[PDB]
Design an enzyme around this catalytic site. Structure first.
Site, PDB file in Angstrom:
ATOM      1  N   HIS A  75      27.181 105.072  53.397  1.00 34.09           N
ATOM      2  CA  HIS A  75      28.055 103.864  52.688  1.00 34.09           C
ATOM      3  C   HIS A  75      29.442 104.381  52.369  1.00 34.09           C
ATOM      4  O   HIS A  75      29.831 104.649  51.201  1.00 34.09           O
ATOM      5  CB  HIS A  75      27.100 103.742  51.464  1.00 34.09           C
ATOM      6  CG  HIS A  75      25.927 102.778  51.579  1.00 34.09           C
ATOM      7  ND1 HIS A  75      24.630 103.677  51.663  1.00 34.09           N
ATOM      8  CD2 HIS A  75      25.713 101.604  51.888  1.00 34.09           C
ATOM      9  CE1 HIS A  75      23.628 102.624  51.782  1.00 34.09           C
ATOM     10  NE2 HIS A  75      24.132 101.561  52.117  1.00 34.09           N
ATOM     11  N   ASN A  76      30.309 104.466  53.376  1.00 37.50           N
ATOM     12  CA  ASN A  76      31.789 104.761  53.368  1.00 37.50           C
ATOM     13  C   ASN A  76      32.625 103.772  53.947  1.00 37.50           C
ATOM     14  O   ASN A  76      32.240 102.528  54.315  1.00 37.50           O
ATOM     15  CB  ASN A  76      31.742 106.001  54.135  1.00 37.50           C
ATOM     16  CG  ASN A  76      30.890 106.132  55.598  1.00 37.50           C
ATOM     17  OD1 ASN A  76      31.307 105.298  56.335  1.00 37.50           O
ATOM     18  ND2 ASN A  76      30.426 107.148  55.970  1.00 37.50           N
ATOM     19  N   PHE A  77      33.654 104.171  54.025  1.00 36.00           N
ATOM     20  CA  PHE A  77      34.721 102.967  54.548  1.00 36.00           C
ATOM     21  C   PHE A  77      34.436 102.383  56.193  1.00 36.00           C
ATOM     22  O   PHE A  77      34.762 101.442  56.319  1.00 36.00           O
ATOM     23  CB  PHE A  77      36.328 103.421  54.520  1.00 36.00           C
ATOM     24  CG  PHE A  77      37.237 102.540  54.970  1.00 36.00           C
ATOM     25  CD1 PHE A  77      37.467 101.374  54.489  1.00 36.00           C
ATOM     26  CD2 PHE A  77      38.040 102.870  56.234  1.00 36.00           C
ATOM     27  CE1 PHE A  77      38.328 100.356  55.031  1.00 36.00           C
ATOM     28  CE2 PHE A  77      38.901 101.899  56.960  1.00 36.00           C
ATOM     29  CZ  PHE A  77      39.167 100.698  56.036  1.00 36.00           C
ATOM     30  N   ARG A  78      33.892 103.417  56.809  1.00 34.42           N
ATOM     31  CA  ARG A  78      33.626 103.007  58.177  1.00 34.42           C
ATOM     32  C   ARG A  78      32.567 102.045  58.169  1.00 34.42           C
ATOM     33  O   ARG A  78      32.410 101.085  59.014  1.00 34.42           O
ATOM     34  CB  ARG A  78      33.209 104.148  59.230  1.00 34.42           C
ATOM     35  CG  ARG A  78      33.380 104.084  60.662  1.00 34.42           C
ATOM     36  CD  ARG A  78      32.947 105.224  61.420  1.00 34.42           C
ATOM     37  NE  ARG A  78      34.041 106.356  61.023  1.00 34.42           N
ATOM     38  CZ  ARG A  78      35.342 106.440  61.728  1.00 34.42           C
ATOM     39  NH1 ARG A  78      35.574 105.503  62.727  1.00 34.42           N
ATOM     40  NH2 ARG A  78      35.971 107.231  61.310  1.00 34.42           N
ATOM     41  N   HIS A  79      31.605 101.988  57.315  1.00 38.88           N
ATOM     42  CA  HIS A  79      30.556 101.054  57.383  1.00 38.88           C
ATOM     43  C   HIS A  79      31.070  99.649  56.864  1.00 38.88           C
ATOM     44  O   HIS A  79      30.450  98.862  57.571  1.00 38.88           O
ATOM     45  CB  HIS A  79      29.488 101.796  56.162  1.00 38.88           C
ATOM     46  CG  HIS A  79      28.311 100.447  55.813  1.00 38.88           C
ATOM     47  ND1 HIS A  79      27.451 100.095  56.843  1.00 38.88           N
ATOM     48  CD2 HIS A  79      28.213  99.813  54.633  1.00 38.88           C
ATOM     49  CE1 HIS A  79      26.613  99.117  56.237  1.00 38.88           C
ATOM     50  NE2 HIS A  79      27.199  99.076  54.859  1.00 38.88           N
ATOM     51  N   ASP A 116      30.230  97.213  49.583  1.00 44.31           N
ATOM     52  CA  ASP A 116      29.682  98.617  49.156  1.00 44.31           C
ATOM     53  C   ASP A 116      30.669  99.327  48.453  1.00 44.31           C
ATOM     54  O   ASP A 116      30.553 100.746  48.362  1.00 44.31           O
ATOM     55  CB  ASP A 116      29.334  99.529  50.201  1.00 44.31           C
ATOM     56  CG  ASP A 116      27.628  99.100  50.636  1.00 44.31           C
ATOM     57  OD1 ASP A 116      26.929  98.725  49.653  1.00 44.31           O
ATOM     58  OD2 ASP A 116      27.344  99.001  51.768  1.00 44.31           O
ATOM     59  N   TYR A 247      19.524 109.387  52.860  1.00 43.61           N
ATOM     60  CA  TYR A 247      18.169 109.174  52.271  1.00 43.61           C
ATOM     61  C   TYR A 247      17.502 110.405  51.823  1.00 43.61           C
ATOM     62  O   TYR A 247      16.680 110.386  50.820  1.00 43.61           O
ATOM     63  CB  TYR A 247      17.331 108.658  53.532  1.00 43.61           C
ATOM     64  CG  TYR A 247      17.162 107.039  53.702  1.00 43.61           C
ATOM     65  CD1 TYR A 247      18.013 106.055  52.650  1.00 43.61           C
ATOM     66  CD2 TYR A 247      16.523 106.205  54.818  1.00 43.61           C
ATOM     67  CE1 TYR A 247      18.061 104.850  53.010  1.00 43.61           C
ATOM     68  CE2 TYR A 247      16.615 105.111  54.955  1.00 43.61           C
ATOM     69  CZ  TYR A 247      17.213 104.196  54.034  1.00 43.61           C
ATOM     70  OH  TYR A 247      17.199 102.923  54.193  1.00 43.61           O
ATOM     71  N   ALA A 275      11.277 104.941  61.939  1.00 40.55           N
ATOM     72  CA  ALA A 275      12.126 104.341  60.839  1.00 40.55           C
ATOM     73  C   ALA A 275      12.576 102.996  61.450  1.00 40.55           C
ATOM     74  O   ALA A 275      12.642 102.066  60.831  1.00 40.55           O
ATOM     75  CB  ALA A 275      13.039 105.106  60.296  1.00 40.55           C
ATOM     76  N   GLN A 276      13.237 103.250  62.838  1.00 42.08           N
ATOM     77  CA  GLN A 276      13.948 102.134  63.493  1.00 42.08           C
ATOM     78  C   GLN A 276      13.033 100.967  64.030  1.00 42.08           C
ATOM     79  O   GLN A 276      13.294  99.954  63.993  1.00 42.08           O
ATOM     80  CB  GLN A 276      14.889 102.836  64.432  1.00 42.08           C
ATOM     81  CG  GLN A 276      16.028 103.628  63.768  1.00 42.08           C
ATOM     82  CD  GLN A 276      17.021 102.793  62.739  1.00 42.08           C
ATOM     83  OE1 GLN A 276      16.587 102.547  61.429  1.00 42.08           O
ATOM     84  NE2 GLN A 276      17.987 102.296  63.035  1.00 42.08           N
TER      85      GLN A 276
HETATM   86  C1  LIG Z   1      16.383 103.892  58.491  1.00 45.37           C
HETATM   87  C2  LIG Z   1      16.018 102.693  58.216  1.00 45.37           C
HETATM   88  C3  LIG Z   1      17.567 101.654  58.233  1.00 45.37           C
HETATM   89  N1  LIG Z   1      17.669 101.194  57.106  1.00 45.37           N
HETATM   90  C4  LIG Z   1      18.923 100.501  57.202  1.00 45.37           C
HETATM   91  C5  LIG Z   1      19.704 100.520  58.426  1.00 45.37           C
HETATM   92  C6  LIG Z   1      20.913  99.690  58.352  1.00 45.37           C
HETATM   93  N2  LIG Z   1      20.860  99.256  56.626  1.00 45.37           N
HETATM   94  N3  LIG Z   1      19.625  99.968  56.130  1.00 45.37           N
HETATM   95  C7  LIG Z   1      19.484  99.961  54.887  1.00 45.37           C
HETATM   96  C8  LIG Z   1      20.817 100.615  54.146  1.00 45.37           C
HETATM   97  C9  LIG Z   1      20.492 100.163  52.547  1.00 45.37           C
HETATM   98  C10 LIG Z   1      19.930  98.702  52.919  1.00 45.37           C
HETATM   99  C11 LIG Z   1      19.372  98.742  54.235  1.00 45.37           C
HETATM  100  C12 LIG Z   1      18.908 100.717  59.706  1.00 45.37           C
HETATM  101  O1  LIG Z   1      19.420 100.745  60.763  1.00 45.37           O
HETATM  102  N4  LIG Z   1      17.895 101.716  59.650  1.00 45.37           N
HETATM  103  N5  LIG Z   1      15.176 102.656  56.738  1.00 45.37           N
HETATM  104  C13 LIG Z   1      14.969 101.162  56.480  1.00 45.37           C
HETATM  105  C14 LIG Z   1      13.431 101.718  56.310  1.00 45.37           C
HETATM  106  O2  LIG Z   1      12.542 100.900  57.110  1.00 45.37           O
HETATM  107  C15 LIG Z   1      12.034 100.015  56.674  1.00 45.37           C
HETATM  108  C16 LIG Z   1      11.091  99.439  57.786  1.00 45.37           C
HETATM  109  C17 LIG Z   1      10.346  98.399  57.692  1.00 45.37           C
HETATM  110  C18 LIG Z   1      10.887  97.533  56.470  1.00 45.37           C
HETATM  111  C19 LIG Z   1      11.990  97.787  55.737  1.00 45.37           C
HETATM  112  C20 LIG Z   1      12.461  99.152  55.665  1.00 45.37           C
HETATM  113  C21 LIG Z   1      14.018 103.116  56.810  1.00 45.37           C
HETATM  114 MG   LIG Z   2      25.053  97.585  49.624  1.00 43.81          MG
HETATM  115 ZN   LIG Z   3      26.353  97.796  53.069  1.00 42.28          ZN
END
Ligand SMILES: C[C@H](c1nc2c(cnn2C2CCCC2)c(=O)[nH]1)N1CC(Oc2ccccc2)C1
Ligand SMILES: [Mg+2]
Ligand SMILES: [Zn+2]
Length: 328
Positions: A75-79, A116, A247, A275-276
């Site tokens: 959660h930085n400027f590049r994001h 953000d 995380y 996770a992905q």
């Molecule tokens: C790592 C995974 C995840 N999270 C992401 C991505 C982009 N934004 N976010 C979060 C940043 C804050 C808001 C959203 C992304 O590519 N992957 N996370 C999400 C979790 O995996 C799930 C799986 C199913 C349903 C919901 C989340 C592990």
């Molecule tokens: Mg946000």
């Molecule tokens: Zn964001």
């Protein structure tokens, strides 16, 4: 391919063209270059022209926004640049200037840049559970998104940063209301609710219906916010490590403070691949599928890389599984 060398902050014609596409490598650029990119987007979209934005104020505002972004792994400027660059790419891909007013494009772009601001690197669940000053200030109602919003308007209140200084008060109120709605819509706790509301309007979508358009703009900022996996593999992949770093920082703190730990944040339970797979399958793909109903061109440009990414992480998972059994 020019007769002389120009400094980094002077974008090459090639960079200007590449910036319109979601294939743009966000990693190649330093803050000053990304700042020049954002500035170009405002001029190119006709926002400087249509809202009489002072070109110097636009630059001072962008520099102030950049300074108010924290040096977090994700959660930085590049994001914020990723989200704004994806919004800009979607304007061209979906021909948004045909369907949306200039005020709506301004709201979408300004909210994407501001969404953000001053993020602490610990999510809403941490804020609420730890009973932080932000959770107490916002009464557990989207504490972060409300804060990003407040910071956005605190920057805009400074006269040398007020890009809306030449907009009449009624226009300002309209932009302000829109930006608040969009930044607050980025809270993932509200994902299912926003998706259900949009799908309900999708039964008979109306571009003349203000409520339908508000929900489409909410879905658009949401798409851009979590769009990393839509980008080419080489650009997409480093962002997952950045997010897991954030995380893990939170989950370690929660364990140390005796607070609940989300399984998708736990070092002992999460892998980049697993996770992905879930996030692409159950969050990313369904959201871009609903957008495809209004914009068919999104399938080839955005669902296709998501299908490829899902298939690649499934291959990587098999390798991780083979590796993890030798760990015991
Ligand atoms: C790592 C995974 C995840 N999270 C992401 C991505 C982009 N934004 N976010 C979060 C940043 C804050 C808001 C959203 C992304 O590519 N992957 N996370 C999400 C979790 O995996 C799930 C799986 C199913 C349903 C919901 C989340 C592990
Ligand atoms: Mg946000
Ligand atoms: Zn964001």
């Amino acid at each position: 391919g020019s007769h002389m060398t120009y400094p980094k902050y002077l974008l090459s014609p090639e960079t200007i063209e590449a910036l319109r596409k979601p294939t743009f490598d966000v990693w190649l650029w330093e803050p000053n270059e990304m700042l020049s990119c954002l500035e170009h987007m405002y001029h190119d979209l006709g926002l400087v022209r249509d809202f009489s934005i002072n070109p110097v104020t636009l630059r001072r505002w962008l520099f102030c926004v950049h300074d108010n972004y924290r040096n977090n792994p994700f959660h930085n400027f590049r994001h914020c640049f990723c989200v704004a660059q994806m919004m800009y790419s979607m304007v061209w891909l979906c021909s948004l200037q045909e369907k949306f007013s200039q005020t709506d494009i301004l709201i979408l772009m300004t909210a994407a840049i501001c969404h953000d601001l001053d993020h602490p690197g610990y999510n809403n669940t941490y804020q609420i559970n730890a009973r932080t000053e932000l959770a107490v200030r916002y009464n557990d109602i989207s504490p972060l998104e409300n804060h990003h919003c407040a910071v956005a308007f605190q920057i805009l209140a400074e006269p040398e940063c007020n890009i809306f200084s030449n907009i009449p008060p009624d226009g300002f109120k309209q932009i302000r209301q829109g930006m608040i709605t969009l930044i607050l819509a980025t809270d993932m706790a509200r994902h299912a609710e926003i998706m259900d509301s949009f799908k309900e309007k999708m039964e008979n979508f109306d571009y003349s219906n203000e409520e339908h358009m508000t929900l489409l703009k909410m879905i658009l900022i949401k798409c851009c916010d979590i769009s990393n996996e839509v980008r080419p593999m080489e650009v997409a992949e480093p962002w997952v490590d950045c997010l897991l770093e954030e995380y893990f920082m939170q989950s370690d703190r929660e364990k140390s403070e005796g607070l609940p730990v989300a399984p998708f944040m736990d070092r002992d339970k999460v892998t980049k691949a697993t996770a992905q797979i879930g996030f692409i399958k159950f969050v990313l793909i369904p959201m871009f599928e609903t957008v495809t109903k209004l914009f068919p061109m999104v399938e080839e440009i955005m669902l296709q890389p998501l299908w490829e990414s899902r298939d690649r992480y499934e291959e990587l998972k098999r390798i991780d599984d083979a590796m993890k059994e030798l760990q015991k």
